[PDB]
Amino acid sequence: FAIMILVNVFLRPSLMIIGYIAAIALSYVGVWILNAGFDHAISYIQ
């Protein structure tokens, strides 16, 4: 019962850092997903 938690508390911090930096760029690229199609996704709509 100690194992899965002792590694747990020892990994977590670094892990959000791993999920931090990528996230900044990822949402970045996310905006451009929208920029890739939005004007064509409202073509007939407008």
Partner: protein
């Protein structure tokens, strides 16, 4: 014509052609009066 760009385009934007696709498959299953004349904008005041 949108199909050719859809080929040059990818599949990660497929959803944005959705209403285009409905514009096609539906077509696969498928007294005049003047409007905006502008005579309404005229005016007549009798009191003048």
């Amino acid at each position: 014509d949108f199909i050719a760009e859809a080929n040059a385009k990818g599949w990660i934007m497929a959803g944005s052609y959705f209403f285009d696709l409905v514009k096609l498959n539906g077509s696969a299953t498928e007294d005049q009066f003047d409007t905006g004349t502008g005579l309404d904008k005229s005016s007549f005041d009798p009191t003048q």
